Design an enzyme around this catalytic site. Structure first.
Site, PDB file in Angstrom:
ATOM      1  CB  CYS A   1      -0.852  -0.029   1.271  1.00 52.86           C
ATOM      2  SG  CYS A   1      -2.129   1.212   1.321  1.00 52.86           S
TER       3      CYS A   1
ATOM      4  CB  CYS B   1      -3.801  -8.457  -4.358  1.00 54.75           C
ATOM      5  SG  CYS B   1      -4.670  -6.961  -4.961  1.00 54.75           S
TER       6      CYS B   1
HETATM    7  N1  LIG Z   1      -4.803   7.539   6.209  1.00 47.44           N
HETATM    8  C1  LIG Z   1      -5.274   7.667   4.999  1.00 47.44           C
HETATM    9  O1  LIG Z   1      -6.297   8.110   4.550  1.00 47.44           O
HETATM   10  C2  LIG Z   1      -4.391   7.052   3.899  1.00 47.44           C
HETATM   11  C3  LIG Z   1      -4.854   7.122   2.505  1.00 47.44           C
HETATM   12  C4  LIG Z   1      -4.092   6.525   1.465  1.00 47.44           C
HETATM   13  C5  LIG Z   1      -2.824   5.860   1.792  1.00 47.44           C
HETATM   14  N2  LIG Z   1      -2.446   5.819   3.153  1.00 47.44           N
HETATM   15  C6  LIG Z   1      -1.187   5.143   3.448  1.00 47.44           C
HETATM   16  O2  LIG Z   1      -1.738   3.809   3.712  1.00 47.44           O
HETATM   17  C7  LIG Z   1      -0.718   3.065   4.411  1.00 47.44           C
HETATM   18  C8  LIG Z   1      -1.429   2.308   5.508  1.00 47.44           C
HETATM   19  O3  LIG Z   1      -1.943   3.337   6.411  1.00 47.44           O
HETATM   20  P1  LIG Z   1      -2.505   2.907   7.848  1.00 47.44           P
HETATM   21  O4  LIG Z   1      -3.253   4.083   8.354  1.00 47.44           O
HETATM   22  O5  LIG Z   1      -3.236   1.610   7.796  1.00 47.44           O
HETATM   23  O6  LIG Z   1      -1.160   2.845   8.632  1.00 47.44           O
HETATM   24  P2  LIG Z   1      -0.666   3.229  10.092  1.00 47.44           P
HETATM   25  O7  LIG Z   1      -1.926   3.216  10.942  1.00 47.44           O
HETATM   26  O8  LIG Z   1       0.187   4.395   9.921  1.00 47.44           O
HETATM   27  O9  LIG Z   1       0.241   1.994  10.573  1.00 47.44           O
HETATM   28  C9  LIG Z   1       1.639   1.991  10.188  1.00 47.44           C
HETATM   29  C10 LIG Z   1       2.046   0.545  10.491  1.00 47.44           C
HETATM   30  O10 LIG Z   1       3.491   0.496  10.170  1.00 47.44           O
HETATM   31  C11 LIG Z   1       4.224  -0.086  11.246  1.00 47.44           C
HETATM   32  N3  LIG Z   1       5.570   0.489  11.302  1.00 47.44           N
HETATM   33  C12 LIG Z   1       5.974   1.804  11.211  1.00 47.44           C
HETATM   34  N4  LIG Z   1       7.290   1.887  11.331  1.00 47.44           N
HETATM   35  C13 LIG Z   1       7.750   0.609  11.423  1.00 47.44           C
HETATM   36  C14 LIG Z   1       9.057   0.119  11.636  1.00 47.44           C
HETATM   37  N5  LIG Z   1      10.173   0.828  11.688  1.00 47.44           N
HETATM   38  N6  LIG Z   1       9.124  -1.282  11.760  1.00 47.44           N
HETATM   39  C15 LIG Z   1       8.001  -2.100  11.732  1.00 47.44           C
HETATM   40  N7  LIG Z   1       6.752  -1.660  11.491  1.00 47.44           N
HETATM   41  C16 LIG Z   1       6.650  -0.262  11.435  1.00 47.44           C
HETATM   42  C17 LIG Z   1       3.433   0.516  12.434  1.00 47.44           C
HETATM   43  O11 LIG Z   1       3.805  -0.188  13.613  1.00 47.44           O
HETATM   44  P3  LIG Z   1       3.532   0.306  15.127  1.00 47.44           P
HETATM   45  O12 LIG Z   1       2.159  -0.264  15.437  1.00 47.44           O
HETATM   46  O13 LIG Z   1       4.655  -0.353  15.841  1.00 47.44           O
HETATM   47  O14 LIG Z   1       3.547   1.833  15.106  1.00 47.44           O
HETATM   48  C18 LIG Z   1       2.024   0.184  11.994  1.00 47.44           C
HETATM   49  O15 LIG Z   1       1.827  -1.235  12.072  1.00 47.44           O
HETATM   50  C19 LIG Z   1       0.296   4.152   4.921  1.00 47.44           C
HETATM   51  O16 LIG Z   1       1.512   4.125   4.177  1.00 47.44           O
HETATM   52  C20 LIG Z   1      -0.456   5.461   4.716  1.00 47.44           C
HETATM   53  O17 LIG Z   1       0.402   6.566   4.444  1.00 47.44           O
HETATM   54  C21 LIG Z   1      -3.234   6.402   4.245  1.00 47.44           C
END
Ligand SMILES: NC(=O)c1ccc[n+]([C@@H]2O[C@H](COP(=O)([O-])OP(=O)(O)OC[C@H]3O[C@@H](n4cnc5c(N)ncnc54)[C@H](OP(=O)(O)O)[C@@H]3O)[C@@H](O)[C@H]2O)c1
Ligand SMILES: CCC1=C(C)C(=O)N/C1=C\C1=NC(=C\c2[nH]c(/C=C3\NC(=O)C(C)=C3CC)c(CCC(=O)O)c2C)/C(C)=C1CCC(=O)O
Length: 204
Positions: free
Chosen positions: A108, A187
Site C-alpha cells: 500500500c 490480490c
Molecule cells: N490515512 C489515509 O487516509 C491514507 C490514505 C491513502 C494511503 N495511506 C497510506 O496507507 C498506508 C497504511 O496506512 P494505515 O493508516 O493503515 O497505517 P498506520 O496506521 O500508519 O500503521 C503503520 C504501520 O506500520 C508499522 N511500522 C511503522 N514503522 C515501522 C518500523 N520501523 N518497523 C516495523 N513496522 C513499522 C506501524 O507499527 P507500530 O504499530 O509499531 O507503530 C504500523 O503497524 C500508509 O503508508 C499510509 O500513508 C493512508
C-alpha cells in the site's frame, strides 16, 4: 495457492483488520511488530509473531523466510516528517524476498501516486515522497508486485463490494480500512493486478 503470508504494518489501522481477515480466511500469518502489546487479544490471532523492526534486515529476513507472499501496510501513523522508513523497509523486504525465493508482494502507498502529482496537500508531501521511493523499490525489484494506491481510508464496514480501477478514478475518494484489507487479500489469489497500480474505492 498462497497459504503462508507475512504482513508488515499489521498493528496499524488497516493492518489490524487485514491481519484479522487473513487469519479468518485460513492464511498462516506471520507478523513483524516492534511492540507486541499493539496486537489484540480478542479475535483472530496470527500464527507467528516476530518482534523487531522493518529497518533491521535480520528482522525482516526472519519474517519473510518460508512465506508464499508478503503484504505491506507500513506507514508513519500521524507523523508527517521527512522520512525513509517505508522505502528503507521495502528495500529490506525485497532483499529478504529474493534471499528466500518469495515472489509476490502486495503493498500500500496512496492514490496520490495516481492523481495529479502537484495536487498533494503540502503537509502530506514528505510522506508521499517516501511512498514514491517505496513504489520505485518495489517496481524495480523483479518481483510480482501489486501496487495498492487507496484514497482516504475510512472506518466504514466491510462490504467486499468496492470497485477497483487502474487509474485513480472511481466511484468515490474513500475506501474503508476493512475493504482495503479485503482487497489486499484478494490480490493474493489473482495475478490480474501484478505489475499494475490499483485504486480501490466505494460509495458507502
Ligand atoms: N490515512 C489515509 O487516509 C491514507 C490514505 C491513502 C494511503 N495511506 C497510506 O496507507 C498506508 C497504511 O496506512 P494505515 O493508516 O493503515 O497505517 P498506520 O496506521 O500508519 O500503521 C503503520 C504501520 O506500520 C508499522 N511500522 C511503522 N514503522 C515501522 C518500523 N520501523 N518497523 C516495523 N513496522 C513499522 C506501524 O507499527 P507500530 O504499530 O509499531 O507503530 C504500523 O503497524 C500508509 O503508508 C499510509 O500513508 C493512508
Ligand atoms: C478530505 C478527506 C481527507 C481527510 C479529512 C484526511 O485526513 N485525509 C483525506 C483524504 C485523503 N488522504 C489521503 C492520503 C493520506 N492521508 C494521510 C494522513 C493524514 N492526514 C492528516 O491530516 C494527518 C495529520 C495525517 C497523519 C496522521 C496520509 C499519510 C499517513 C500518515 O503518515 O499520517 C496519506 C498518504 C488521500 C489519498 C486522500 C484522498 C481521499 C479523499 O477523500 O479525497
Amino acid at each position: 495457492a498462497v497459504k503462508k503470508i507475512a504482513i508488515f504494518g499489521a498493528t496499524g489501522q488497516t493492518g489490524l483488520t487485514t491481519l484479522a481477515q487473513a487469519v479468518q480466511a485460513g492464511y498462516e500469518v506471520t507478523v513483524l511488530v516492534r511492540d507486541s502489546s499493539r496486537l489484540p487479544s480478542e479475535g483472530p490471532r496470527p500464527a507467528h509473531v516476530v518482534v523487531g523492526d522493518v529497518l533491521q534486515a535480520a528482522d525482516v529476513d526472519k519474517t519473510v523466510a518460508g512465506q508464499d507472499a508478503v503484504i505491506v501496510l507500513l506507514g508513519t501513523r500521524n507523523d508527517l516528517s521527512p522520512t525513509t522508513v517505508m522505502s528503507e523497509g521495502a528495500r529490506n523486504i525485497v532483499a529478504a524476498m529474493k534471499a528466500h525465493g518469495v515472489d509476490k508482494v502486495v503493498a500500500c502507498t496512496s492514490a496520490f501516486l495516481l492523481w495529479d502529482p502537484t495536487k498533494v496537500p503540502p503537509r502530506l508531501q514528505a510522506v508521499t515522497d517516501d511512498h514514491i521511493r517505496m513504489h520505485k523499490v518495489l517496481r524495480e525489484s523483479g518481483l510480482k508486485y501489486v501496487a495498492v494506491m487507496p484514497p482516504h481510508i475510512g472506518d466504514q464496514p466491510l462490504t467486499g463490494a468496492y470497485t477497483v480501477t487502474l487509474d485513480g478514478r472511481g466511484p468515490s475518494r474513500v475506501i474503508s480500512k476493512h475493504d482495503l484489507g479485503h482487497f489486499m487479500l484478494r490480490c493474493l489469489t489473482t495475478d490480474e493486478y501484478d505489475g499494475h497500480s490499483t485504486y480501490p474505492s466505494h460509495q458507502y
